[PDB]
Amino acid sequence: QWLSCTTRHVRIYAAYIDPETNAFDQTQTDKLTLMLDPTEEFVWTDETCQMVYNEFQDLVDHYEGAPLSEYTLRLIGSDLEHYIRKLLYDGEIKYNMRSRVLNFSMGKPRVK
Amino acid sequence: TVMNLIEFPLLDQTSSNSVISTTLNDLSNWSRLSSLWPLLYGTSCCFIEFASLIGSRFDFDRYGLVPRSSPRQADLILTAGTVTMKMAPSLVRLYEQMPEPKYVIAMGACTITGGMFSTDSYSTVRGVDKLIPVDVYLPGCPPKPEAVIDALTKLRKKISREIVEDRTLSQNKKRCFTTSHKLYVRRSTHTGTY
Amino acid sequence: MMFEHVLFLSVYLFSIGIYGLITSRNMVRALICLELILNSINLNLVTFSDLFDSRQLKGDIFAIFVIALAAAEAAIGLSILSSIHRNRKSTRINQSNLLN
Amino acid sequence: GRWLDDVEKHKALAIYPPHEGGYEGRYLNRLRYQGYYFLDLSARGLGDPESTLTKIHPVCPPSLGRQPVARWYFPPEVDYRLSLLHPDAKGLIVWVYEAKVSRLQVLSKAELQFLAMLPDLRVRVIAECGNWRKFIWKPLKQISG
Amino acid sequence: SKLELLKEVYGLISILPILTLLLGITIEVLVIVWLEREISASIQQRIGPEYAGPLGLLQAIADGTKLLFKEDILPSRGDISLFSIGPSIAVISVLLSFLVIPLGYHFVLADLSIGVFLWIAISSIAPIGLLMAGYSSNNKYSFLGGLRAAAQSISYEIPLTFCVLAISLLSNSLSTVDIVEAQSKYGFFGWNIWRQPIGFLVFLISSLAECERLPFDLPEAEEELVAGYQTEYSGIKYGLFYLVSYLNLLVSSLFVTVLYLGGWNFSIPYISFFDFFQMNKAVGILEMTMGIFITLTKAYLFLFISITIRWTLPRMRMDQLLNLGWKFLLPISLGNLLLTTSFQLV
Amino acid sequence: MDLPGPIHEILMLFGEFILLLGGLGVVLLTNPIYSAFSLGLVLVCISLFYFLLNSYFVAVAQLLIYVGAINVLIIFAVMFVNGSEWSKDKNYWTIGDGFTSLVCITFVFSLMTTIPDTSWYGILWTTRSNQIVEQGLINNVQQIGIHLATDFYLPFELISIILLVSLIGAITMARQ
Amino acid sequence: PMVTGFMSYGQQTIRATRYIGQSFITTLSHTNRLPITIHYPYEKSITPERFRGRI
Amino acid sequence: LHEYDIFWTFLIIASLIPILAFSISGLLAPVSEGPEKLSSYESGIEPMGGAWVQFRIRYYMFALVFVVFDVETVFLYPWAMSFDVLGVSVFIEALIFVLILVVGLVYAWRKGALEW
Amino acid sequence: ILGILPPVAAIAFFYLFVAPPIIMNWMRLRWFKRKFIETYLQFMFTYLFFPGLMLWAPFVNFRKFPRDK
């Protein structure tokens, strides 16, 4: 069923959920939706996420020929966990900046 | 020449609230921290001493720590024992399926980094915060049976550091994206028969 | 409006009790509506034994007996439901006309 | 503002609470509405605290078993946090949580005196140390030396 | 004139004593949860809910206030159509029972000659709410988790009835006050628990499973699936279920002591507490507080007995529980009535 | 015994409006378990009607023997009918829906116009000796208590064997 | 038969009671025992001279 | 049997109690939890699907025998109240009554009805 | 009607003044070495003087107490 790689900030859902509630948690699993970091570890302006949305087709259509297995889900999440690292290593995106614990998965800032 | 600077504080954070409307939530969060309940979870090399926290050596139940074996009820879960790649895709479901005043922490040095499982192995996950946002990281493999109570006392203050306007930072939005697939389905592999 | 408004609701239940009976499709719904009709008649009965006949209650005893027989019938009908669902693996009432 | 009675004027103090913390958070709640914004540190771990509050100090990251010299040259946390602070802010309220008992550099009382000057010269710092059941506060500079 | 109604607008009802009963029952809930969390987990253990002040006297209401917010979740399958409707029946079934329960000399809330009958009738409405709640969701661990309890509860009211009737036929009444009236004769000889201990045994053993004792056999073993039909019920829902459980316990203790023991009678008959002094001056508040005193302690004794029994027997499985409730308690709970018939024949 | 006052008709209308919606839920909703729960609601709100009128036993018993045993039995029964969510939209079934909703309304009209022509408050005056006795000093659990066994001896002796036969038949039928 | 049941129904109950009351009066000295378990967090355990903490 | 006005006031108050508590919870609550929220407690990742989990075959017999054996009590109560008031005839009548259902219970016991 | 206040005031104040701060001392003095029925002594009193026992329950206030003018 809905066996998706639901890692932090990487939830490639193998089932249609883009309502407030999927009403079945899967909606028969025919769309393969995705939500980006509900914990707000990164604040998003549309333009910044537009490159990720564009390369989503590069990851779902350009290099996909294997059946619906989490093998492909790791094949996606691997580059997904480094596209954000690249987008931050060049300063285009920044961290949460809210009243949460403000954890640093990639460590504190640097001086280049 | 700073790398990965922090975002600017957008609000000016300038406000003033009445005491008769603030002390209510103040004592409410005081109760919320002084009535926390554990959630049962424990796997491996950094767990077993949790059991001793219920006896005559260590007794954290003295503070009202009611151990609940259910996600939707409790709010405090201890990721005791070193976690691997698997048992995680169902672990995060627990954090997703409990009320919002969770304020989860960690336990076991092999869960903040993966200490004794960090030379070469395709099973162990490097830390837990790369799966779930928690607050405090607890060292020790096995974790010191007293350090956990001290870290609970530490976290006991963060909730007391909350105000009435803070009860809006748990509301969510939806970055729900409309993207489909084109691939072939796989039938269920975990066939339950003998 | 005690003595007058309640009876105005007896029919307004009895009728419904019959309708759900006729338009019923599953056995359990038909039995529910049957019980509903019996309760309608019970209610139409009791009020009569409160306005008058207070020396020796002649309605409340009859209401008790009606409730007892209603419970007995609701037991027996469900018992028959067990056996029918054992024989055929569906209890669709209106799809069994092999006796005509 | 009972804390305000001994923070704006002194700018140097230490919190002596009971060893549970279940009575002190209310105090921290009130100091978000003047220009004071929280910086918790848990001082244990850093070397000479000067280069931790003024200078670009290389914080050696937790090593991964291999990789000889690799230190990301981390920055200080005073002037940058001022740059993120608005021009409408009274002071930087800071908590030296690991100030106690009852090439590193022991954060002794001399180091606290040298952390009592950044409040005055160029952060409203408060030391932490558990004490008697009644939540008390005391100027640590006189305790310092 | 008297156009519609002169003195009949709203000034015929006062809601003071009802709210006093509410405050009292809430305080007693705090007391009983303190009893549990300070005696059960302290037999050979550490102290109970310390650090909530001196002792856990504030811990109970602290847990209540914490459960108050707790962001009620309302799962998807099943909704307000039956979810919020579930625990309401549960809480009302035991809250309304507080009507006919007395506390002392002339402190009953309603004479209600059908009192104990009303209590027995209201005790057999909870299973409806339990089945509704357990089915208000869709997944397992709540459907069967509630089905088990709703089923096994049904297997016990018959001994309850055949033990309450074996006392109604002794007191020749159905109102609690007259029951304790027929029992204040010999101080403690005339107490029904000595006249009919065979009925008291059945009532006491049934009371355990009737107030969900035990719903889970072990501190680690669940309530037979993962939990007792209260898994998704997170905030005030689980709070109300905790309440209704403790309140069933309380009503059972109060009823067994008001039936088989002297309700507000001393060890010496209740009327005799006035005659031996030849005069009384201010016995009003004395007798009021002493009725709250000599009565609540007797039920406290059974609270403690149940607390102790909690850690002495492995509560049976629902393969033995039905057997015990049906083929064991029913025959003797009928035979005691068959005996007391000829016993009260005189 | 008697009732408070002009609060009476308030509770009367309230209970009537509750019971109407209850019956409509019994008869309309397709999901049978919702129907059974609405039936339970109907029966408790009619037990309250029984209690309002000063007849106490036939109220509390009706609450115990129906709102208890019968409803939980029916709930157990609905665990044997599979397949729900039939059609909908304004008489989901065939024209038989309309034919019923016609003939039932004719039945209503007939009885509902027969009733408001009999002066019930005038049929109460002609009997001023029936409810004028009370036997001298009795309460209303002893009225039934005695008048069930002093003259209703035969049906009380009878009902028991009916119960026994029903039990035997139910066990012999339900068991395979 | 029933005479064997009329003889053993008291035996089952007497065994149940001989076990229940025995365990009850035995755990009586446990519910009100005189042991003192772990004290507050200000009463940490003693540590002999072979362990490992912060190197 | 004089004034159930206290009963009615207690009914309305204790029926307002649950909706009052629910509404009070709702007022001071979080407008949050837009997560999955479509699956319930202690579940294998998203387990979903399944039916025909009844085992009504066993418990139905218990329910039936209970429903039949219950009616005894609401007939005994008017008798249990009117023992001394009347003579001893009601004693024999109720003995016949109860003995009928004792025989019924004996039958239900012998032939396997009350089982595992 | 004049001298009625001292009697009903002194006993009603003692009913809620002395027991609250001393129940916590009698329970803290012995908690693990009690007898089989000793815990029954002060626990019952936990209700009787309750008019004031809750006033010295953890409700004990730590307000800032505006000082002498």
Curated annotation (Swiss-Prot), chain E:
InterPro entries, alphabetized: NADH_UbQ_OxRdtase_su1/FPO, NADH_UbQ_OxRdtase_su1_CS
Residues annotated as transmembrane: 15-35, 89-109, 114-134, 150-170, 188-208, 233-253, 289-309, 328-346
Catalytic activity, EC: 7.1.1.-
Record keyword Lipoprotein present: no
GO molecular function: NADH dehydrogenase activity; oxidoreductase activity, acting on NAD(P)H, quinone or similar compound as acceptor; quinone binding
Cellular localization per UniProt: Plastid, Chloroplast thylakoid membrane
Subunit organization: NDH is composed of at least 16 different subunits, 5 of which are encoded in the nucleus.
PANTHER family noted in UniProt: NADH DEHYDROGENASE SUBUNIT 1, NADH-UBIQUINONE OXIDOREDUCTASE CHAIN 1
Protein name: NAD(P)H-quinone oxidoreductase subunit 1, chloroplastic
UniProt gene name: ndhA
